[PDB]
Amino acid sequence: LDAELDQLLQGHYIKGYPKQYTYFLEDGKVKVSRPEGVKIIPPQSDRQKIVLQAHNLAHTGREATLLKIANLYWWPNMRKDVVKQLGRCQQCLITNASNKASGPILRPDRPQKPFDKFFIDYIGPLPPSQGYLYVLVVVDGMTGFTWLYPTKAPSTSATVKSLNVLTSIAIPKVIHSDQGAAFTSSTFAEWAKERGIHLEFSTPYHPQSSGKVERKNSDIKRLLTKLLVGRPTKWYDLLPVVQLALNNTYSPVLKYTPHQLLFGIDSNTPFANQDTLDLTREEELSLLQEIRTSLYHPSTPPASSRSWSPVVGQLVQERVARPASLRPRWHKPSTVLKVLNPRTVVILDHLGNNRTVSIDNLKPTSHQ
Amino acid sequence: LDAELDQLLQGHYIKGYPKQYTYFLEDGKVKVSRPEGVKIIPPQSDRQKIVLQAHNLAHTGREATLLKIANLYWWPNMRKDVVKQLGRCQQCLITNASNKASGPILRPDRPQKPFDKFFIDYIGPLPPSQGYLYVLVVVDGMTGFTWLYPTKAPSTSATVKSLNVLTSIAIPKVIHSDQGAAFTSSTFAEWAKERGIHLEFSTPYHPQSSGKVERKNSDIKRLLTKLLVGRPTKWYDLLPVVQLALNNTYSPVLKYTPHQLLFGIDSNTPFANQDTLDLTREEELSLLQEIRTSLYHPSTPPASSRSWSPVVGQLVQERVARPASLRPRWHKPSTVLKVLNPRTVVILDHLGNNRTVSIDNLKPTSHQ
Amino acid sequence: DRPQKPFDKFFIDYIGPLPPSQGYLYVLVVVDGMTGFTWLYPTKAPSTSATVKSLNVLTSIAIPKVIHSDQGAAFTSSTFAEWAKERGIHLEFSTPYHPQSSGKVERKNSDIKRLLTKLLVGRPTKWYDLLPVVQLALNNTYSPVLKYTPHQLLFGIDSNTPFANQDTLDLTREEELSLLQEIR
Amino acid sequence: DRPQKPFDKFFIDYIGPLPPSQGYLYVLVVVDGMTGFTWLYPTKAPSTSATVKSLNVLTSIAIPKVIHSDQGAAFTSSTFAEWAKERGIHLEFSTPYHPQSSGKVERKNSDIKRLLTKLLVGRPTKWYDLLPVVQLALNNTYSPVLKYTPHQLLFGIDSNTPFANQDTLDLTREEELSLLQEIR
DNA sequence: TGCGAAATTCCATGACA
DNA sequence: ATTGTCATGGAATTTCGCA
DNA sequence: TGCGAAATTCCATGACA
DNA sequence: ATTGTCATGGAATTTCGCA
Numbered sequence A, B: 001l002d003a004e005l006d007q008l009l010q011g012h013y014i015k016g017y018p019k020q021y022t023y024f025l026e027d028g029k030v031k032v033s034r035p036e037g038v039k040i041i042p043p044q045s046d047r048q049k050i051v052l053q054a055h056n057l058a059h060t061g062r063e064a065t066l067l068k069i070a071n072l073y074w075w076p077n078m079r080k081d082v083v084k085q086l087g088r089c090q091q092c093l094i095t096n097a098s099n100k101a102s103g104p105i106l107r108p109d110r111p112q113k114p115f116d117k118f119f120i121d122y123i124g125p126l127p128p129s130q131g132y133l134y135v136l137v138v139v140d141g142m143t144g145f146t147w148l149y150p151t152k153a154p155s156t157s158a159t160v161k162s163l164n165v166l167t168s169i170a171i172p173k174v175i176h177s178d179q180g181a182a183f184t185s186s187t188f189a190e191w192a193k194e195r196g197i198h199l200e201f202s203t204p205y206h207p208q209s210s211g212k213v214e215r216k217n218s219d220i221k222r223l224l225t226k227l228l229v230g231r232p233t234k235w236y237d238l239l240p241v242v243q244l245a246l247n248n249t250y251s252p253v254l255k256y257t258p259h260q261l262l263f264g265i266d267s268n269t270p271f272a273n274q275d276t277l278d279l280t281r282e283e284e285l286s287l288l289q290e291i292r293t294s295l296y297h298p299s300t301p302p303a304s305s306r307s308w309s310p311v312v313g314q315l316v317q318e319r320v321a322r323p324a325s326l327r328p329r330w331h332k333p334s335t336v337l338k339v340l341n342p343r344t345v346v347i348l349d350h351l352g353n354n355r356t357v358s359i360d361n362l363k364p365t366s367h368q
Numbered sequence C, D: 001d002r003p004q005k006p007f008d009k010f011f012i013d014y015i016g017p018l019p020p021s022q023g024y025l026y027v028l029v030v031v032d033g034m035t036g037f038t039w040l041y042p043t044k045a046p047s048t049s050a051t052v053k054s055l056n057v058l059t060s061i062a063i064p065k066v067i068h069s070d071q072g073a074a075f076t077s078s079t080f081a082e083w084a085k086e087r088g089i090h091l092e093f094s095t096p097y098h099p100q101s102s103g104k105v106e107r108k109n110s111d112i113k114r115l116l117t118k119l120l121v122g123r124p125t126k127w128y129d130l131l132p133v134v135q136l137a138l139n140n141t142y143s144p145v146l147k148y149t150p151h152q153l154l155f156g157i158d159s160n161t162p163f164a165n166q167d168t169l170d171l172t173r174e175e176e177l178s179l180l181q182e183i184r
Numbered sequence E, G: 001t002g003c004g005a006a007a008t009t010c011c012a013t014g015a016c017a
Numbered sequence F, H: 001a002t003t004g005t006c007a008t009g010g011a012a013t014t015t016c017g018c019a
């Protein structure tokens, strides 16, 4: 716009250009004497190209792009034009990191009864022991009572075999698992349908969702590590010992062991609690029903100073799962279809697929 | 000590045993009726074995070991005896995690002049490009000015070849590097001695120590990523472009580019700053000397609520570098010989070797 | 005298030899005395080795204070006695030729033997896969004397698999003739 | 008229053919007009390709506003002209047979040619490895006219390698006879 | 009605790779 | 069409033993 | 001597694997 | 015998343009 710049040279006011400055012509270009120095005022029709040229040098953000532009030019609301370019650079949007943390975690209510929800996961590969490499970990959500199964692979077949042994005791309402091949198979879905078991899946690449079993994986490995100090890593024969050990370990915050929450009475294990000896089994089960309901429940922690929470319609970006060397860590912008809760969201990518993702694997697209 | 328990049965006071309780004999053992219930008082000579038996079930900490013991027994200051056992369990000390964070980071003073200190490091392996797999990154500490060299391996030979090209410009006083094979070799030490260059090494497995170059590795990779979007990863021909791009990029906090801090004047690059055009080179170098000294310097951040700081004589434990599956993450306790600064320490392991380590790779041994 | 509790006494016994199913010929039966809860383990023999291998799985969940059995070789061996002493389990035997347990247990072992016989007819070689459903049936079976099922008495909650469809347990004239046909 | 600055003009030229050292036969010489700073690049030929390959390394550190050279084939080619236009570098040529630069530059190229000749005698095939030490020498060499060395004028600091031991640059009677011996 | 010490509770730290 | 968890050992706070 | 908007500064976040 | 660093883009704060 050389027409807009003409009125300025004459001396009459244009909204955006301060009247107190001296606008002139030199070397065939409109100039202005600003405190910083004499800058060139490019016509509106040239500004996009300048911003793009400045930005493209090192694909710089707001201030670093501005500082370059400001070396030669001046125009009203330069950063407004810088931000327009930053918001259109596909390379920057998919390569840059987020600088907004996720909102505070949710502390889902503890399942009310044992067998309401099981959390399952695999540990491994571990050093080979008797031809076994993996461990199938089953955690009852309410009690924390764990069942351990050595497997040769994290397969549907080994999960089914193990769970057919476990479910001889009781059948769970729900089985929560991650999106590992072993649990997302049609063979596993068929196995659950046949038994009235509902399969609930974690958002992908978010093991915090399976937090209950993940945390038990830490204790299993920590104990196996201790027992195997200065000996070959023959863990296969220790799984039963580890299982019994952990199921009978106090949780200092609850002041109960997973065995006690499941049965309301210690079995013939060392240091068995004898406090309900004079109670009848009915009096004992009545006290257990009371203990199970009065357990401590943590609350959501404070939000960090710079957190973001999802909004329907918001342009958001999913994190690349297994990013290759020298490739972007982010996918192209997506739109938030539904906000399931403040930490879970349904998105529609550029393909047109519906994906239920965790906000931990999302960043809000920058510059609107 | 069945002698100590005899005086108690008679009814006369012993320090530690509250007089208000009823101490008796039953089933051939001293008992006490406590609010919790009737507990057995084992003789002092039996307590160590009980604590060890309770602890060994799942190698439990203080409260979880106590809660088991308390199920059957009672004695004065039980936790004092629990903590004695925890402090002697080699398996627990080398397997358990720390729960004390390191003290706040140091913000070393910025080198005063260009060429005072160089920070060097390798990036790679990268996808092969023209037979090259690595990048030798050289960062001048004062300026942030970077030199990039493609290499076929992170070798002493490729470092020497590259640095012989760089040092044709100027020779540094110090070269700071990590403990990578390429820089710790005798051939590299010989190469530096020959040139008056002092080699300074980071504490092992602590890349924050090489923070200056590490941070530049992020920008190099981020820019290569952007330029290679939707194209094969042919990075070899982009190193020169990336080098020039980054050396001429503003640091928003300093309001200077690494080129400007090194030369005090922009070369014929896009958007070159023209503010010193009327100054003589001497006036220009005078202003540069002033700019170099007035640069922003960050200060140590606040200590976290539960941090630990090293003390000479303290029992401390070094982190295992490459821990194997099902093996302890910690080495056996060591003693702090000298405290170089609040974040660096000299230790003596059980072997008798002197090691300069970062507190980030140390935990203070628990239970004194 | 203290009220009866789960894990106070486990009653063990062997069922078989049965037709081979997945290489297995016997079922070790474990019944908790108080709750009446049943655990079934298929073995290849009524041996101490097989008893120990099976009971090592059960004792990784809960350890009984007492194990009760008849004078079968597998239970009277010095090996099985060493195994029990290690776990602090007291062994208890019924008089030879005079097997005694409890009313609740004697009745439970009858239902076990009958339910197994009922499902063996037609598929006598497919019982290995049926052991889990046989246990859920048995453990979700209402107790006339106690008002609660073994599952309720052990966990203090209702089950997600209530076996409301209380079946015959007795053989139909068709199953009866089909059973005598296998006896050839 | 604005004061002279570094990167305002780079004076380029070729030295050679020299005895082969590591396969190289020529040295492209780049002298900054203002500071007198020297960059040396060994080439296998005085070609546009070699000039472009060498200057691509230099222009990754700093780009001159103007390049000055004589009418040598490598610098007058349309390829070298395309290369300069791409980088916004103005090419400037001296009149054929009349090479003009500046007093500071003319003197610098004399020291370069002399220092090279001085070190070529005895080890004429080992100059590739000596190029870094030759440059540090040249750049840490005090300027009578300006009071400062090219290193000081370019970085605004003293160097860690001061070449206080100001040598001859002239050939000794032993080096003179040894030089004429090679001329065979 | 209050003191010193012991017992209990709190809770940041870190790992489930 | 879902969602972090909790053992750990110093510190902070409460309770105990006695008066 | 004070208003609205623009410009600048602040700074938590996250990655150097 | 050593030690974190700094681009990034919303928010917070300051400065500018005008009166």
Ligand SMILES: C[C@H](O)CN1C(=O)c2c3c(c(O)c(=O)n2[C@@]12CC[C@H]1C[C@H]12)C(=O)N(Cc1ccc(F)c(Cl)c1)CC3
Pocket (backbone or CB within 6 Å): A121, A122, A178, A179, A180, A181, A205, A207, A208, A209, A210, A211, A214, A215, E016, E017
């Ligand atoms: C392709 C690649 O293998 C994908 N993948 C994992 O990386 C992975 C992890 C874990 C799994 O259970 C798990 O299944 N996987 C899968 C996804 C499904 C199946 C292929 C396996 C896992 O537990 N960890 C440890 C971890 C780390 C941080 C935490 F906060 C928590 Cl709570 C746990 C994190 C890595």
Ligand SMILES: C[C@H](O)CN1C(=O)c2c3c(c(O)c(=O)n2[C@@]12CC[C@H]1C[C@H]12)C(=O)N(Cc1ccc(F)c(Cl)c1)CC3
Pocket (backbone or CB within 6 Å): B121, B122, B178, B179, B180, B181, B205, B207, B208, B209, B210, B211, B214, B215, G016, G017
């Ligand atoms: C045997 C094993 O290869 C050992 N090892 C590394 O793991 C490693 C890293 C790094 C190196 O430079 C590096 O040299 N190494 C070496 C040690 C010496 C040589 C064998 C290589 C490195 O930069 N990163 C990224 C990183 C991560 C977190 C940070 F806070 C920072 Cl500032 C950087 C962390 C991993």
Ligand SMILES: [Mg+2]
Pocket (backbone or CB within 6 Å): A121, A122, A178, A180
């Ligand atoms: Mg998993």
Ligand SMILES: [Mg+2]
Pocket (backbone or CB within 6 Å): A121, A122, A207, A214, A217
């Ligand atoms: Mg996992």
Ligand SMILES: [Mg+2]
Pocket (backbone or CB within 6 Å): B121, B122, B178, B180
């Ligand atoms: Mg390195």
Ligand SMILES: [Mg+2]
Pocket (backbone or CB within 6 Å): B121, B122, B207, B214, B217
């Ligand atoms: Mg590194």
Ligand SMILES: [Mg+2]
Pocket (backbone or CB within 6 Å): C013, C070, C099
């Ligand atoms: Mg019998």
Ligand SMILES: [Mg+2]
Pocket (backbone or CB within 6 Å): D013, D070, D099
């Ligand atoms: Mg010439």
Ligand SMILES: [Zn+2]
Pocket (backbone or CB within 6 Å): A055, A059, A060, A089, A091, A092
């Ligand atoms: Zn960009």
Ligand SMILES: [Zn+2]
Pocket (backbone or CB within 6 Å): B055, B059, B060, B089, B091, B092
């Ligand atoms: Zn231990």
